[PDB]
Design a protein around this ligand. Sequence first.
Ligand code: ZN
Ligand code: ZN
Ligand code: ZN
Ligand code: ZN
Ligand code: ZN
Ligand code: ZN
Length: 412
Amino acid sequence: ADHQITKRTDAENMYNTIQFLSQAPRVAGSPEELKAVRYIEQQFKSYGYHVEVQPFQFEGYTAPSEVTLKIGTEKKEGEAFTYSPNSDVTAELVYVGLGTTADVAGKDLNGKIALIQRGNISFADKVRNAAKQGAKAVIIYNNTDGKLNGTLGGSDASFVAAVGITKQEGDALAANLRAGEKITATVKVAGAEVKTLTSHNVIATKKPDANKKNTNDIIIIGSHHDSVEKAPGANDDASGVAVTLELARVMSKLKTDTELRFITFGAEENGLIGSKKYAASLSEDEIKRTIGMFQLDMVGSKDAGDLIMYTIDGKKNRVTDLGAAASSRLSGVLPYGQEGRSDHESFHALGIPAALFIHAPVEPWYHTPNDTLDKISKEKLDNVADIVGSAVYQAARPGELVIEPIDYPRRN
Ligand SMILES: [Zn+2]
Ligand SMILES: [Zn+2]
Ligand SMILES: [Zn+2]
Ligand SMILES: [Zn+2]
Ligand SMILES: [Zn+2]
Ligand SMILES: [Zn+2]
């Protein structure tokens, strides 16, 4: 059965998809993401699919033009978190540990700037908790080297300007404050702005066409078509889009007894907005009938590691069982691990078996201007299409689904 897939997976087709999409970054809600949506829609149509485009709005964020952070007089290096409000405050700096509801409680922060350490709770909770006590601004310092780049999740007027700084420059301030030093700081954020944008999900569905063998099962194969600012996103995630499109083309040449939904989600980098919006469109019957959701994200980099399957809870499910079965016949042992950070999380949330297929550890070009076409491996793209396609086909081919018992290890 695998041969029906493996003899049809065209690596050149996938390479070409990536070439077209990665000519420029595809920031969610931008003209470039719209261009990708149109392109993807047209390719699905070319394979004979009826296509639907689901629109949705979300709050976008334009990084601030001026990020000035100063400790008394010396100018420091800091980066405002996404969705950070604007500010022009100069006041005493107060250390509030991790910034929990208790840490900031027993401390006078009214009109002051809070110094918080990165820990477990979200950057959003810290800013929010500090702002609740009167803090006019928040300075968060990293736990490791390198600049601290984070996001407050989404817009929220309850926030106050928030900027991040490296661990070294943070432990120093915290130490002096604990030592009893009275420090004054300056936090000025200008340029930041939030506006409503529209993104889209592209859905191509192949209804079962066997006949008496048709089941009422549904399988979703997805990827996301947006990329981060300044990143051409060849591997993240044009690669996933490419495999999604090619597998749709491959399946159009075969009879199936399972409904297949090939989807490219928008605004994945903004917090899985697209997939959340699509998941929310499903009926209770559709949810119970979806036997598995396969997410393809970063599956073609010559500089990435081996293929692995990630689940939200780090447990095996129907999708990892199918992935492992296919791989066992085609390439060898395919491990699984625990990780979210992609659209499969939106389906796992509904109780639908889901897994992310990705090459880990990821390449160093991840989310950089270096995530380009010349880093792509046709051989790897073809391998992923072969494995994911055969895993899906094990279920979609006419006849009852049978998954033989096979062992595969969990790997972190
Ligand atoms: Zn192959
Ligand atoms: Zn092939
Ligand atoms: Zn639209
Ligand atoms: Zn991605
Ligand atoms: Zn990404
Ligand atoms: Zn080779």
